[PDB]
């Protein structure tokens, strides 16, 4: 055979870890992204980009350590190590936040490689590729949040930083500046995630509580063997239970599993649409009728107006330290307060 | 409050007063719901991927399963092999009952 | 200047995987038949083409 | 003495509508309909919230 | 004290529910699963 | 105050998919009843 | 012209009908507040 055929044979060998053609893209990119995240959370500081200490060397713990986004002085630059910003200097590249761009780009290519890996393993095994279509959900989440949102904004600075407390900051910052809870696409995403968790729990409990008595032991995990031509749980009993308890029940296992697949994927894609909308500040921030009613009626108050006041407080009290490049200086008199209202 | 914006106000005030995001139990709950979504999607993908051909191309694959049938509608072995090749071989739920017990357990515990 | 792939590439395998029935399944079927689980709605769980084909010939 | 509207007929949509929790003056005191001087007083202090929550 | 014993009360309510349900199932005789020979829902008429 | 277009959008985007689904279901049931004994 | 061999019947289940009606009504409820603004 040819060289290509021999390489295909070697990459397809049944080893402990499958490599495949997609591995040539997945393994280096994912390995470099993970290693860069560890390096940033262990050694690299954020002092020259965010005015923050985010590293174990500076004294941070697992929650407060992060690979922070590049400085706002950089635009949407690729921040190549050899690029004009760093010019080959590793220290300056780390100080300007280039490690965040390294992690984000190599991680996006790692996600692409993992999706291709799912496709390739599905093709070789001989099954339908409903994986790498489920993973399109997380891929869309990553693309919309870590790539499309900063690209729509001023720079990479407003992307989420790769850390726990950094992610929490990003949540509160987006809530303050966009009112993302009020966004209907985010509502559909929340519904999808919570419904997927509900489906997982309810399906697990339903299967565990409708098993056939296929063993004499009280512990029933031994009663199942993979080479079974018979179903291990009663679908009829489960359908009767949920039809007389909830009013409706699944009767088709294939439809049930497709639904358990579809709900989180649809939720993630709707949330991705919402974040893409946020990328251009095209947000469902306010209801015009409610604002007009509150403006002409000081005694009119709803929880939406309280949320608007909370978002204004978040923005005003976090702008100075969250965006140090803007050099925001707000006197105490102009800072919103409940007593000030 | 028994509403949507009221719920958002409750969440924001709770985060302000108590810093629930830094609470390890809310982190466990977030892990529970995220894992529930991931595991529901994964289980659905593996079952739908390994559906045994019981239908023609002109109809939905869901009709390949008949309500009350005694045989299994999908190949557990094929899905197990695909999952054990997507990650290392050891990480795989060969037992269907144990897999469904874990599916029930994780989000409930979260 | 001075071979055909001959592969369909539009073909579903379309081979039905037959499953056999045992005595236990037959006993369950008889018990369900005695309770009317097979009468009532005959078109449930069947596609339009499947129901049409089964109604055309018995 | 600054009420908060959460009903559709008082200027709310589906998103902004809510059943407002009980009055802070009530605290966690049991507040059924018969423990209020008038039905208007019961509605003004968030009694339906307690009713819905308990049931 | 309040947080600890409230958590303990909740988890022991969970334990009571689990052990009471399993006691009922074991006394009735189907805590190991459905018999698959005389299935209770197969004798009940549909709907 | 509220726009004409807002009510029009809500009502039409509710009704048109609904009547499409109802028409499709009625057509399917008609095929089922015609093929089966009636 | 003539008889087209690619014609196929289209079927919608009652479950599918109810899923569709529920989806449309829920989307209408969700987006009505934003359309009315």
């Amino acid at each position: 055979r040819g060289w290509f055929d021999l390489m295909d044979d070697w990459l397809k060998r049944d080893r402990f870890v499958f490599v495949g053609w997609s591995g040539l893209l997945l393994f280096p990119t994912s390995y470099l992204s993970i290693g860069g995240w560890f390096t940033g959370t262990t050694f690299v500081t954020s002092w020259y980009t965010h005015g923050l200490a985010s590293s174990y060397l500076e004294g941070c713990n697992f929650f407060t350590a992060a690979v922070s986004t590049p400085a706002n002085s950089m635009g949407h630059s690729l921040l190549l190590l050899w690029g004009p910003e760093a010019q080959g200097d590793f220290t300056r590249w780390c100080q300007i936040g280039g490690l965040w761009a390294f992690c984000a780009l190599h991680g996006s290519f790692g996600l692409i490689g993992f999706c291709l890996r799912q496709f390739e393993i599905a093709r070789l095994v001989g099954i339908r590729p409903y994986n790498a279509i489920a993973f399109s959900g997380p891929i869309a989440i990553f693309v919309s949040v870590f790539l499309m949102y900063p690209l729509g904004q001023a720079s990479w600075f407003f992307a989420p930083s790769l850390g726990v407390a950094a992610i929490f900051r990003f949540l509160l910052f987006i809530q303050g500046f966009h009112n993302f809870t009020l966004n209907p696409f985010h509502m559909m995403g929340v519904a999808g995630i919570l419904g997927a968790a509900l489906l997982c729990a309810i399906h697990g409990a339903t299967v565990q509580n409708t098993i056939f008595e296929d063993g004499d032991a009280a512990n029933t995990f031994r009663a199942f063997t993979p080479t079974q031509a018979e179903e291990t749980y009663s679908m009829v009993t489960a359908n009767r239970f949920w039809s007389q308890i909830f009013g409706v029940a699944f009767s088709n296992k294939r439809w049930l599993h497709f639904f358990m697949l579809f709900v989180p994927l649809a939720g993630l894609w709707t949330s991705a649409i919402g974040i893409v909308g946020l990328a251009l500040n095209l947000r469902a921030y306010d209801f015009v009728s409610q604002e007009l009613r509150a403006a002409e009626d000081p005694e009119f108050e709803t929880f939406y107006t309280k949320n608007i006041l909370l978002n204004e407080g978040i923005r005003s009290w976090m702008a100075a330290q969250d965006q140090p490049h803007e050099n925001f200086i707000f006197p105490e008199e102009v800072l919103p307060r409940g007593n000030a209202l | 409050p028994l509403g949507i914006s009221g719920t958002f106000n409750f969440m924001l005030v709770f985060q302000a007063e108590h810093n629930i995001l830094m609470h390890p139990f809310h982190q466990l709950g977030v892990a529970g719901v995220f894992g529930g979504s991931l595991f529901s999607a994964m289980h659905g993908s593996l079952v739908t991927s390994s559906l045994i051909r019981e239908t023609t191309e002109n109809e939905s694959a869901n009709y390949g399963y008949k309500f009350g049938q005694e045989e299994e509608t999908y190949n557990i072995v094929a899905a197990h092999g695909y999952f054990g090749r997507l990650i290392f071989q050891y990480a795989s739920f060969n037992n269907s009952r144990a897999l469904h017990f874990f599916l029930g357990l994780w989000p409930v515990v979260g | 200047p001075r071979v055909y792939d001959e592969e369909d590439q539009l073909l579903i395998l379309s081979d039905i995987v037959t499953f056999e029935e045992t005595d236990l399944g037959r006993r369950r079927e008889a018990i369900a038949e005695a309770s009317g689980w097979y009468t009532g709605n005959p078109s449930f769980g069947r596609s339009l083409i499947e129901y049409s084909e089964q109604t055309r010939k018995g | 003495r600054e009420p908060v509207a959460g009903s559709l007929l008082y200027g709310n949509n589906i998103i902004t509508g809510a059943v407002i929790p009980s009055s802070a003056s009530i605290g966690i005191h049991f507040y059924p309909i018969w423990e209020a001087a008038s039905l208007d007083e019961w509605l003004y202090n968030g009694g339906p919230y307690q009713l819905i929550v308990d049931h | 004290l309040t947080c600890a014993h409230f958590l303990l009360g909740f988890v022991f309510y969970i334990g009571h529910l689990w052990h009471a349900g399993r006691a009922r199932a074991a006394a009735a005789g189907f805590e190991k699963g459905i018999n698959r020979e005389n299935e209770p829902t197969l004798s009940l008429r549909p709907i | 105050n509220v726009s004409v277009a807002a009510y029009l959008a809500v009502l039409l985007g509710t009704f048109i998919p609904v009547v499409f689904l109802i028409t499709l279901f009625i057509q399917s049931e008609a095929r089922k009843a015609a093929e089966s004994g009636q | 012209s003539g008889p087209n061999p690619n014609k196929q019947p289209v079927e919608l289940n009652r479950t599918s009908l109810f899923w569709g009606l529920l989806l449309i009504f829920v989307l209408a409820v969700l987006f009505s507040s934003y359309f009315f603004n």
Binding site: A249 | F67 | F44, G45 | - | - | V2, Y7 | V26, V29
Partner: peptide
């Protein structure tokens, strides 16, 4: 006037739930 639309949508959703529960396709063994 929008309150009428909101109430109509909510009542329609509740009626759809009612018809899905009490007028579903009855499951049968095939």
């Amino acid at each position: 006037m929008e309150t009428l639309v909101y109430t109509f949508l909510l009542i329609g959703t509740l009626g759809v739930l009612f018809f899905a529960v009490f007028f579903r396709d009855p499951p049968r063994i095939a």
